[PDB]
Structure formats: structure tokens, C-alpha cells
Amino acid sequence: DFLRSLDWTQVIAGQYVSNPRFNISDYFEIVRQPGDGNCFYHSIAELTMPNKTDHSYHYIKRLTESAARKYYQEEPEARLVGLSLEDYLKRMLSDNEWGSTLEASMLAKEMGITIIIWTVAASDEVEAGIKFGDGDVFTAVNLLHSGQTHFDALRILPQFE
């Protein structure tokens, strides 16, 4: 019921924002990811890959590379970054290099899925969501962005199905 009531504003085509307020653990289980620079990709792999391991994220980075080749040139967020495609890739593919909303938008299109990033205040309550794709929250790969500096993976609690 609460999850189906979220008000998504489509700010730019394929990208949506919402500012509901809730306790992450009221609706999701948090699956913690290591703090090694790679946790964005760890978190995607936890939700998308079978028999995920601490090595699974390499494949996600490799899909992000494939994704970038197709989509980097029309991604609005790439305008912040200001790199050529080949320089972007070299830095993206680097060890411990943080992933971001840029990779999320590109991966969403490449994997044909919806990715939501839930960002929480210092208080731990959610204060925003950004959604990449047209799917709803029940369909999506949900991530938790906390301390403004870390990603973890989220699974919808069994009672909300």
C-alpha cells in the first residue's frame, strides 16, 4: 500500500524523482556491501546475479563498459563528467573507482531494468529516491545510498511481496 502510493515526478525522460519519508528497514532488508570503492557494482550484482560473490562485480563493470559504448554519448549526466568515452572507460574500469547515478542510468537501459537509488539523511530516514527506468519499486533493483558515500543493496521485505 505505502510502496504503491509513491509519487514519482519524471524530471527528464526515463529519470524520476520522489521525496517520500520512511525508515528503510520498515520496507526493505539491507544487504551490506564492502567498502572497497566497488560497492555500487557489488550492490547491482547482489540483486541481478545468481551465486553472487565478492568477484561478481567485475561483470557489472564490464556491462557498464558495454553500456557506455552505446549510451555515454546521450547521457545527460556525462556532461558533468566532461570526459571522452575512452577516458571515462579507463577511469570507470580503474580499481576502486566509485560508481554513480551515471552508471545506474546506463545500466538500466543496457540491462532493460529499473534502478532506484534511495538516499538517506544522517538520521537514516529516506529523504529522496531517483529512479532510472519506467518500472515500479516492486520490479526494481533498489539501492541504498548512505553517508552520501556508500551503496548497499535492498530487498523488498517478504510481507510487501
Partner: protein
């Protein structure tokens, strides 16, 4: 002239701007009022991300227009 900027949390601030202000200028005003670095700002109007070297005028942004500020999030 006054315009409105709605941030990621739905918080809506006022800025005093001029039609000849660049997008870069508007970001610096957002930073001074809200403490958000220009590097993480995506300013968005009427469905499109605005470009740094253009002006509010270039996009026909007028008195009491609303912009969306979406942040680039790294982790």
C-alpha cells in the same frame, strides 16, 4: 528576478537571478545558499538538463519559473 529551485528532497528555495545569468552562475548561488558543490548539480528545466555556458534567457526561464535540482550521487 525570483525563480524557484526544487531539490532532490522536494525542498524549494528561491533565487534572485538575472536573465543573463549563466547556468554556472545559478549553481554558484545554489552552493552559497544550500552548500551544494556545482560539480554535483544537475539543473533541469522543462524536461531537459541545462548546459553550463548557456543563460537563463536562452531557455526562456522567466520570473517564478521552477527548476529541478538533481544531484549526481557517488558511492
Amino acid at each position: 528576478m525570483q525563480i524557484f529551485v526544487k531539490t532532490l528532497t522536494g525542498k524549494t528555495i528561491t533565487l534572485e537571478v538575472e536573465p543573463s545569468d549563466t547556468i554556472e552562475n545559478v549553481k554558484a548561488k545554489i552552493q552559497d545558499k544550500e552548500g551544494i558543490p556545482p560539480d554535483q548539480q544537475r539543473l533541469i528545466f522543462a524536461g531537459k538538463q541545462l548546459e553550463d555556458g548557456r543563460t537563463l534567457s536562452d531557455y526562456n526561464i522567466q520570473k517564478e519559473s521552477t527548476l529541478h535540482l538533481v544531484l549526481r550521487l557517488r558511492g
